[PDB]
């Protein structure tokens, strides 16, 4: 996505466009004839201002792509005249070099889920100092839209956030994670952004919604104060029993006295929430009577919530995907059983030459405990492919905890080559599916190279991967892909220009939470076979029976990774550490029930095309 997917949903958000158009109309008609749009994007708000009757509008845009996009959009609405587009950061605008005079109004949307994270403060400190007329002591004085913001917080239970920042278990498929290894997420990048109005498994409010801070965007003396201001130590009373998983954060923008917009979680709004995961506590269970403690500081750009507590030893930093992995139990229970079945078929004497062990290579991209599980099964010499030294220490300490004598687990990294001179691999684990929901690049090549390093009857895991698909009517996937005409942009012609950058395939999708309608059943779209390349789909057609009548907009897809013909891992399972993906159609097709719809699935290297025929 060269053009950020936020651009599509926000331009389709008719409410937001109307609230901003009314607020700018109000300001213009009250004398604000000179407007500066910071982060103009497609330049809709700048076009609003000129349409409202502003004399001169100046639209600055950081991104080259978005700047060139606005030039076309503004030019195409026959408004190139009174609006100057500036490929620049706000900070680098100078009067009179770039803009003739100081402006009487600033409009800005440089706002993320945690409000401050797109540098609105720094931008508006500069604006008052250099670009804006003096404030009120109208065409005489300068003002900003939005005028002010109120930042809210809420302690929440949410097992979906939990499984991404905390390792919930003490034992994974036979191996024990020692108490002396403390797994922390990277958020211990201070907040993640989630559409909490549809987060899988929902969330529960453990506290009442509380006020984290306020900001007056029309007060320069206040904005300059935030960098040095001492953190606000607070404690929020608990109102419901549950597990403290995160502090869910949103805000309310006051554009003017009459118009406001909230990022409060809602299936009506497009807005996402700042999620501050809770970790590094002995217990997470909170009850009515207890207090959620935290320090709030906005000193260096981001809103920070540190020192989260409740009032009534090696550290291994894992990625969220790696924590999710450690919590994906079926994945590890499957791998344990699938490996042992192969260890039994080769040399069942070695399953729990004496000096010769089972050679097991794990080529999993990131952190993985598959080698340890293997080590517990029999006379096995397992190899780790972890790069990070922090990961090596953790796995060494896990190995110690699972009664491995020193140097039992080896580290391959410090090219796919034989384990020894005249010895071959009994099992080779490969990384087939990206977290994105697409196939790993050069998987067929690594699979082919790996086939030749195998012992007689040895196995690459997974042996094959089936991609499953689904016909869905999803307005949501459609409205996140392409702008729906002119109506939503309030008569302005922007859709034909932004929709040039239409993504064919949506990645990092939470299929489970997606609002859509199934028009079919999950159907096998292609086979990717690691043991037998010949059974790989080159470019095959699939006949999909249409179970429900509706407007086909997308084909969500996931995988069934087969370790053997019996044991299969699902990349769409509840505990899955993979996200799913979807082919979104450029033009939606109306499908009738009882109809045998054809899909043209082309597969080359790790790329897959799906089209309606």
Ligand X SMILES: CCc1ncccc1CNCCCCSC[C@H]1O[C@@H](n2ccc3c(N)ncnc32)[C@H](O)[C@@H]1O
Q: Which residues of the shown chain bind ligand X in the complex (CB under 6 A)?
A: 4, 6, 10, 38-39, 41, 60-63, 66, 89-91, 109-113, 118-119, 123, 263, 270-272
Q: Which is nearer to ligand X, 193 or 455 (CB)?
A: 193
Which residue's CB is nearer to ligand X, number 118 or number 160? 118
- In the complex, what is the shortest distance from the CB of residue 120 to ligand X, in angstroms, rounded to a whole number? 8
Residue 129 or 241: which CB sits closer to ligand X? 129
Question: Residue 474 to residues 545, 547, 588: CA-CA distances in angstroms?
Answer: 18, 16, 10
In terms of CB distance, is 193 or 549 closer to ligand X? Answer: 193
Query: Which has the closest alpha carbon to 430: 418, 406, 446?
Result: 446
Alpha-carbon gap, residue 527 to 212, rounded angstroms: 51
- By beta-carbon proximity to ligand X, the closer residue of 38 and 585 is 38
Please give the backbone phi and psi of residue 82, each rounded to the nearest 5 degrees, phi first.
-90, -5
What's the rounded Cα separation, in Å, for the pair 319 and 366?
9
- Please answer whether residues 581 and 555 qualify as being in contact, where contact means their C-beta atoms are separated by less than 8 angstroms: no
By beta carbon distance, the residue nearest ligand X is 39
How far apart are CB 68 and ligand X at their closest, in Å?
A: 12
- Cα gap 403→489, rounded to integer Å: 65
Q: Minimum CB separation from ligand X for residue 112, in Å?
A: 5
Closest CB to ligand X among 66 and 530?
Answer: 66
Least distance to ligand X from the beta carbon of 126, Å? 8
Close Cβ partners of 277 (under 8 Å, ≥ 6 residues apart): 161, 162, 164, 165, 166, 185, 187, 188, 192, 245, 246
Question: Smallest gap, in angstroms, from Cβ of residue 89 to ligand X?
Answer: 4
Residue 54: helix, strand or coil by DSSP? coil
Shortest CB 246 distance to ligand X, Å? 16
* Greatest Cα-to-Cα distance within the chain, rounded to the nearest angstrom: 92
**Residue from 290, 249, 238, 306 nearest 272 by CA:** 249
- Shortest approach of ligand X to residue 483 CB, angstroms? 14
Distance CA 536, CA 502 (A): 29
Question: Residue 53 and residue 354: Cα distance in Å, rounded?
Answer: 88
Q: Which is nearer to ligand X, 157 or 194 (CB)?
A: 194
Strands (E) across 404-445 are located at 410-411, 425-430
Q: Which is nearer to ligand X, 105 or 175 (CB)?
A: 105
Closest approach, Cβ 91 to ligand X, in A, equals: 6
Rounded to whole angstroms, how far apart are CA atoms 413 and 454?
19
Q: How far apart are alpha carbons 286 and 288 in whole angstroms? A: 7
b/e 86-98 (16+ beta carbons within 10 angstroms → b): beebbbebeeeee
User: Which CB atom, from 39 or from 334, has the smaller least distance to ligand X?
Assistant: 39
Residue 227 CB, shortest distance to ligand X, in Å, is 17
């Amino acid at each position: 996505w060269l053009v950020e997917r936020w651009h599509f949903i926000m331009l389709n958000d008719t409410k937001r466009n109307t609230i901003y158009n009314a607020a700018i109309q109000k300001a213009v008609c009250l004398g604000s004839k000179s407007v500066l749009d910071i982060g103009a994007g497609t330049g809709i708000l700048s076009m609003f201002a000129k349409k409202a009757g502003a004399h001169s509008v100046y639209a600055c845009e950081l991104s080259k792509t978005m700047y060139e996009l606005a030039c076309d959009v503004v030019a195409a609405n026959k408004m190139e005249a009174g609006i100057k587009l500036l490929h620049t950061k706000s900070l680098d605008i100078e009067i009179p070099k770039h803009i003739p005079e100081r402006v009487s109004l600033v409009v800005t949307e440089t706002v993320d889920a945690g409000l401050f994270g797109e540098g609105i403060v720094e931008s508006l400190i500069h604006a008052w100092e250099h670009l804006l007329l003096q404030p009120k002591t109208c065409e005489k004085y300068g003002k900003v839209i939005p005028a002010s913001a109120v930042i809210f917080g809420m302690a929440v239970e949410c097992a979906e956030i939990r499984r991404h920042h905390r390792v919930g278990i003490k034992d994974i498929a036979g191996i024990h994670l020692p108490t002396n290894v403390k797994f922390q997420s990277p958020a211990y990048e201070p907040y993640t952004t989630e559409k909490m109005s549809r987060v899988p498994g929902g969330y529960l409010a453990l506290t009442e919604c509380f006020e984290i801070m306020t900001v007056d965007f029309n007060n320069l003396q206040e904005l300059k104060s935030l960098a040095t201001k001492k953190p606000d130590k607070i404690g929020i009373p608990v109102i419901k029993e549950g597990i403290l998983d995160a502090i869910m954060v949103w805000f309310v923008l006051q554009l003017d006295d009459e118009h406001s917009l909230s990022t409060s979680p809602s299936e009506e709004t497009c807005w996402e929430q700042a999620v501050y995961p809770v970790q590094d506590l002995a217990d997470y269970w909170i009850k009515p009577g207890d207090h959620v403690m935290m320090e709030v500081s906005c000193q260096d750009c981001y809103l920070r919530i540190q020192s989260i507590s409740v009032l009534g030893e090696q550290t291994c930093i894992l990625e969220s995907t790696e924590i999710a992995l450690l919590n994906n139990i079926p994945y590890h229970e499957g791998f344990k059983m699938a490996m042992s079945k192969v260890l039994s078929s080769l040399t069942p004497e070695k399953l729990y030459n004496i000096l010769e062990p089972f050679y097991v290579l794990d080529v999993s991209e990131g952190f993985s405990v598959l080698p340890v599980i293997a080590g517990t099964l029999g006379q096995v010499k397992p190899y780790s492919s972890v790069e990070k030294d922090q990961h090596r220490i953790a796995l060494d300490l896990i190995s110690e905890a699972n009664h491995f004598p020193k140097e039992t687990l080896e580290f391959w990294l410090r090219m796919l080559q034989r384990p020894k001179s005249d010895k071959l691999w009994s099992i080779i684990i490969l990384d087939v599916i990206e977290p994105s929901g697409l196939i790993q690049q050069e998987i067929m090549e690594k699979a082919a190279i790996s086939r030749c390093l195998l012992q007689s009857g040895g196995k690459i895991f997974p042996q094959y991967v089936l991609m499953f698909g689904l016909l869905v009517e999803s307005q949501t996937l459609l409205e996140e892909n392409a702008v729906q005409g002119t109506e939503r942009t309030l008569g302005l012609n922007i859709a034909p220009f932004i929709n040039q950058f239409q993504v064919p395939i949506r990645v990092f999708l939470d299929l489970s939470s997606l609002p859509c309608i199934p028009l079919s059943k999950p159907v096998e779209l292609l086979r990717l076979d690691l043991m037998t390349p010949y059974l790989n789909t080159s470019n095959r057609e699939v006949k999909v029976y249409v179970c429900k009548s509706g407007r086909l907009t997308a084909i969500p897809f996931w995988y069934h990774m087969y370790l053997d013909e019996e044991i299969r891992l699902d990349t769409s399972s509840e505990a899955s550490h993979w996200k799913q993906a979807a082919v979104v159609l450029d033009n939606p097709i109306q499908v009738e029930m009882g109809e045998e719809l054809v899909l043209s699935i082309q597969h080359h290297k790790s790329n897959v095309s799906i089209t309606v025929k």
